[PDB]
Amino acid sequence: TDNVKDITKLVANLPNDYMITLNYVAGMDVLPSHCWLRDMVIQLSLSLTTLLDKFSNISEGLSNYSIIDKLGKIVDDLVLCMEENAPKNISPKRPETRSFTPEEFFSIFNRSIDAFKDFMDCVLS
Amino acid sequence: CGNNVKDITKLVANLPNDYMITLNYVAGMDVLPSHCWLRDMVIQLSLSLTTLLDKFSNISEGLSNYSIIDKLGKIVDDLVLCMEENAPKNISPKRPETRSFTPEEFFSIFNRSIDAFKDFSDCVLS
């Protein structure tokens, strides 16, 4: 049901100097969403997959594995929707591989999901 | 003075496998007799835990990393008090080796220091 209310606890339970790697799609902060939403949900999917593998599945209490896994599932549904609707052949460039703080990584995450809630040319320079 | 862990296992399981935890490692801790390195190591763990703690927010419910680490830091404060109150005069072989360890490795050093404390030839190396 598009759920945060669990992201804040994850961020509070992740080291604030831990660098989460993400292939940031350039211009996600300026261009209209149809230009980057698809690519970004896919990149978030890859990063969450990579992130989840860094924890163990604690089953009782605050579990980072649990929250990340839940987030991964939400994104899989987003990738399904975006993919099974994207414009043919989606060749700008292959996203800037950057590392982000958990707070930063997850702010980007929220901005992408938010972008979905309103998903109804793409040039830079 | 002797002495409870609030579960390091859950902590290690809730910390990223590739997160590097910095520790000024006291050389010879793995071979030298305990009285040669315990005091210094307990002091070093205390510093690393201080630094580690400042990386998390205090989550109140759900056995958070902040709470467990904070608990481990207090246990070490008691251990530092004990070792300092009984440390030899002027404790200077050489400073500790600043290294980075994975959480499993860091807390393995911690558990081994704790054990050494639980059971507390002169200090020669090389």
Side-chain angles (χ1 to χ4, degrees):
Chain A
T1 321
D2 313 305
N3 289 294
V4 282
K5 184 187 178 184
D6 40 44
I7 291 177
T8 295
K9 253 164 157 50
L10 208 220
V11 170
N13 219 211
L14 283 177
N16 60 45
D17 57 334
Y18 179 61
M19 295 315 286
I20 297 166
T21 297
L22 174 75
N23 298 322
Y24 190 78
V25 176
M28 168 214 86
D29 36 5
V30 302
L31 298 167
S33 85
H34 75 266
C35 295
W36 57 262
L37 228 194
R38 213 275 315 208
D39 287 339
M40 268 306 298
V41 56
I42 287 167
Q43 299 288 14
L44 285 162
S45 179
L46 293 183
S47 290
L48 290 172
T49 293
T50 283
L51 186 66
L52 180 68
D53 174 72
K54 306 300 184 285
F55 300 85
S56 296
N57 182 186
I58 305 178
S59 75
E60 195 155 56
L62 281 164
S63 186
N64 288 355
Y65 181 97
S66 180
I67 304 168
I68 293 169
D69 183 58
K70 171 184 172 301
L71 291 178
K73 269 89 161 299
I74 289 170
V75 179
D76 294 319
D77 284 318
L78 295 174
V79 167
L80 213 198
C81 184
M82 291 294 99
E83 260 308 71
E84 189 164 351
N85 279 291
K88 288 290 280 56
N89 287 52
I90 306 77
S91 177
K93 242 59 180 299
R94 301 320 81 196
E96 186 192 11
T97 310
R98 298 206 286 179
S99 70
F100 301 84
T101 236
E103 205 291 326
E104 288 171 349
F105 174 80
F106 283 105
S107 74
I108 294 175
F109 179 93
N110 284 157
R111 279 180 248 137
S112 297
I113 265 53
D114 174 61
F116 263 92
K117 304 181 177 183
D118 315 302
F119 195 73
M120 231 55 90
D121 53 57
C122 313
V123 183
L124 296 179
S125 47
Chain B
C1 29
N3 276 294
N4 232 63
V5 295
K6 267 216 63 183
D7 282 309
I8 291 176
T9 296
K10 199 266 179 59
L11 213 224
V12 171
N14 225 32
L15 278 179
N17 302 314
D18 56 342
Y19 184 58
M20 292 320 275
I21 298 166
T22 297
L23 174 67
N24 301 317
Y25 188 80
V26 173
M29 166 219 196
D30 42 8
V31 301
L32 238 33
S34 141
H35 78 270
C36 295
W37 54 265
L38 233 209
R39 183 256 182 185
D40 288 322
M41 264 300 305
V42 84
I43 283 175
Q44 292 314 318
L45 288 168
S46 180
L47 295 192
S48 288
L49 289 170
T50 287
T51 287
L52 226 218
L53 184 68
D54 172 72
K55 276 65 203 311
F56 301 81
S57 291
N58 182 183
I59 304 177
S60 72
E61 174 168 355
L63 238 184
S64 66
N65 291 357
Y66 183 95
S67 52
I68 306 169
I69 291 169
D70 181 57
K71 167 70 184 306
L72 289 181
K74 295 191 171 182
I75 299 289
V76 180
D77 286 340
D78 289 332
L79 294 182
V80 171
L81 208 199
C82 181
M83 296 289 92
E84 201 60 14
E85 190 80 18
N86 309 167
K89 286 299 290 62
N90 290 55
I91 304 72
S92 179
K94 191 131 297 180
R95 309 313 87 240
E97 181 176 56
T98 313
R99 307 210 295 176
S100 59
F101 299 85
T102 199
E104 255 289 347
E105 292 171 353
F106 176 78
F107 287 105
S108 171
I109 304 314
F110 173 99
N111 277 165
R112 286 180 274 201
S113 287
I114 294 302
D115 290 336
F117 179 75
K118 300 196 305 173
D119 309 302
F120 191 69
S121 55
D122 100 307
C123 324
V124 181
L125 290 176
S126 67

